Design a protein around this ligand. Structure first.
Ligand code: SAH
Ligand code: SAH
Ligand code: ZN
Ligand code: ZN
Ligand code: ZN
Ligand code: ZN
Ligand code: ZN
Ligand code: ZN
Lengths: 430, 429
């Protein structure tokens, strides 16, 4: 059928999209869409159920592989048609079993089509076969990364899968890299990847009118602005903190397009985001271009460093970069804030909560002013800063920060969402 | 309808343009703004994308950095067309290389979607009415148009509403027949455009008007005496080559055979295929062999420029000129063509002394094979002129430049900007 209040249409310049037929207010559920295929990330095993993504302590372990946990035998046998793709190879390959998460998700996509080749209730407006691939635009270096995924697919998932032509496998991974979703928790921590066909129909905008939240394996779409009949439903694919140039670089790299919304054409927030300190002698333009290029490099340098460097060395990257940037950038600069945010996360892992709160409170005020009204990046930041206070018995500034997240999350997740209950339950704990 | 001219059906040539009032040599028949246009890739940074203004120091486009404008005025004025390529040029990167015909065709579809009514550029012949010569398309020729439709969907599928593939075949066929290539004062390629009213004029190897450009505006000026009732004729091809070579391009590219005075009588075919009668007169078959050889090496040099070094291109000319000099006189148009190519290669190596030695040899016989007012002769005088100005040979330099002014003042007009800059080159001491 068709989702009530919404209609599929061809947006001029954006291919296909989702358009509203009835008015939607801030907080209204536009539609819900169950996952077509989904996988729990490796680092969250034991904390969430494999079948329904229920976070709970004490989960029944899988007898054969011991690396898959369920709430009970109910969720176990329900997940077996998909778990059988990995249960046996995880023990046979042992340490050598390490497929990418995109390959894990793709292997279950092929499995779902094999045991359910007709339209699922997850694709009432956009079938999985209709996913745009951008195959024409794949760079040669990008083509080897997709071929390396097909090689791992045959390497790990050859037991239960009937593989189509290699041409059909290249286009399948291309669609997954464009239409794939990453499930996140309340703290915006990575929980897994999934495919939501009807949700993938919505286009991108740096000033979106809806935000996507998750209730286990079910994706919920809720309006973050006022949506009138005839207006297209827009979401955000990327982190809206960085300037127009940085945003469109991720968009062109990962999705093969350049955003042309109000923010991207006028560069309104580019002044406040690339904020410069107006000392007596204003920094020359070349001194600004050098620091911005320096800031983007060290941000990518920190991403590689986390994979193999000690926490004390990751904190040294932040404190060194902050010194070099503080000569030109004000503390409200998004690059200064990013490094300070990474330093806050490293302190939270070393359980130096006092040091993380000094970073969290410093950045929270300038952080929120660069985001939309109801943003999950701001809500999760208030949650992280909130729960750190509750562990140090600072329940004054703790519940004050938690109510800020609840205010934003009640619009994004909804008032009945389970995340809203647990945060209220954390303020009740005396 | 344009005053002084009328659209009519020429017997044997479909439709054409006919004059109603007398026109003197140099009179502007009409002017026509471009319907769709595109700047060639190799002239970016030298000319504005919107108005083809040649100027140093052009504002670069922030998003793609591969599109230059005079100012933000011309930038946003070209945005309804530039947005078709701005984003894909960065996304595709190195792999973005559509043919210029596809670039121009993609902008035609953009113009018709935001302006489906009659434009002031089609006061006598609409774009929909362009002849297609679809019946005459060879099956192998159909593969080049299908290869262009494939690239059209491949590169311009984001902002374009594509009709049926049948409607796309007929569209590219119209572009290949009615398309124009904008040239500068040296007849160097600046881009492609569509001038509907200008495309109405038929071809003749002795034309009465010549088409010049003032930025993106095409200007038509008479090169002969035009009486009321006479059809307005232009030239589609380079009038240097013999009748057989000329009509081969016409049947290949425009699917017709010219039947003007030159083609029916072959008057200049004797002087163009001039043969030197040494003591033992060259055999008749030896002429057919050298002519076929000369036409082959001309196409052989055409492929070589795309991937061979300039020092190797000069070896192709000097080798062919030696073999041809046994039968052909130095005034032969085939000898002149290779010498013209050698002159251009020497000018790229900045060996202007070596290029001037070729230029002076060919300039006098070159002009005698062309009409009185021909841009091919004007541009040749311009290249020879400014080459002297770089070597401080301003005597023979301004003397060669005054020859271009004589021809260009009739073709381009006395108010044309090209006439001002060359006068500024003689005034610069
Ligand atoms: N704001 C935007 N402007 C132009 N293209 C956009 C866009 N937002 C999304 N897209 C396009 O949509 C793709 C994301 S998947 C979203 C659905 C897609 N339009 C479809 O119907 O298949 C991207 O590859 C991008 O090319
Ligand atoms: N001298 C000539 N003799 C015969 N046909 C000619 C011609 N010059 C042009 N043509 C014809 O006209 C086409 C050129 S495009 C210009 C206009 C065409 N008469 C029209 O109907 O709109 C050629 O491709 C050929 O079909
Ligand atoms: Zn469960
Ligand atoms: Zn198992
Ligand atoms: Zn944007
Ligand atoms: Zn301009
Ligand atoms: Zn651009
Ligand atoms: Zn002729």
């Amino acid at each position: 059928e068709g989702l009530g209040g919404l209609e599929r249409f061809c947006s001029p310049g954006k291919g296909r999209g989702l358009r509203a037929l009835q008015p939607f207010q801030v907080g209204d559920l536009l539609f819900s869409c169950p996952a077509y295929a989904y996988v729990l990330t490796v680092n969250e095993r034991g904390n969430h159920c494999e079948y329904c993504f229920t976070r709970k302590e004490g989960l029944s372990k899988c007898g054969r592989c011991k690396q898959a946990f369920y709430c009970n035998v109910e969720c176990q046998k329900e997940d077996w048609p998909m778990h059988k793709l990995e249960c046996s190879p995880m023990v046979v390959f042992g340490e050598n079993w390490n497929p990418s998460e995109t390959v894990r998700l793709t292997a279950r996509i092929l499995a779902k089509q094999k045991i359910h080749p007709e339209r699922t209730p997850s694709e009432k407006l956009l079938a999985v076969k209709e996913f745009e691939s951008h195959l024409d635009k794949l760079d040669n270096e990008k083509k080897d990364l997709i071929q390396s995924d097909i090689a791992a697919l045959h390497h790990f998932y050859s037991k239960h899968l009937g593989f189509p032509d290699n041409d059909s496998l290249v286009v399948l991974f291309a669609q997954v890299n464009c239409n794939g979703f990453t499930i996140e928790d309340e703290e915006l921590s990575h929980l897994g990847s999934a495919i939501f066909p009807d949700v993938a129909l919505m286009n991108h905008s740096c000033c979106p009118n809806v935000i996507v939240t998750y209730k286990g394996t079910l994706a919920e779409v809720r309006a973050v602005q006022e949506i009138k009949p005839g207006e297209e439903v827009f979401t955000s694919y990327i982190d809206l903190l960085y300037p127009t140039e940085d945003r469109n670089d991720r968009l062109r790299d990962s999705y093969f397009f350049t955003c042309e919304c109000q923010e991207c054409t006028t560069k309104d927030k580019d002044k406040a985001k690339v904020e410069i300190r107006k000392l007596s002698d204003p920094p020359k333009a070349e001194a600004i271009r050098d620091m911005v290029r320096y800031a983007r490099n060290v941000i990518e340098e920190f991403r590689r460093a986390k994979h193999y460097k000690s926490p004390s060395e990751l904190l040294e990257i932040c404190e060194l970069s902050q010194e070099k940037m503080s000569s030109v950038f004000e503390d409200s600069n998004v690059y200064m804030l990013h490094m300070m945010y990474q330093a806050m996360g490293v302190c939270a892992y070393m359980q130096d909560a006092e040091g993380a709160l000094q970073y969290g409170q410093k950045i929270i005020k300038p952080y929120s002013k660069h985001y939309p009204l109801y943003s999950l990046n701001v809500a999760s930041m208030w949650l992280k800063l909130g729960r750190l206070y509750m562990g140090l018995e600072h329940k004054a500034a703790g519940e004050k920060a938690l109510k800020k997240a609840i205010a934003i999350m009640e619009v994004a997740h909804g008032k009945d969402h389970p995340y809203i209950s647990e945060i209220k339950q954390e303020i009740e704990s005396h």
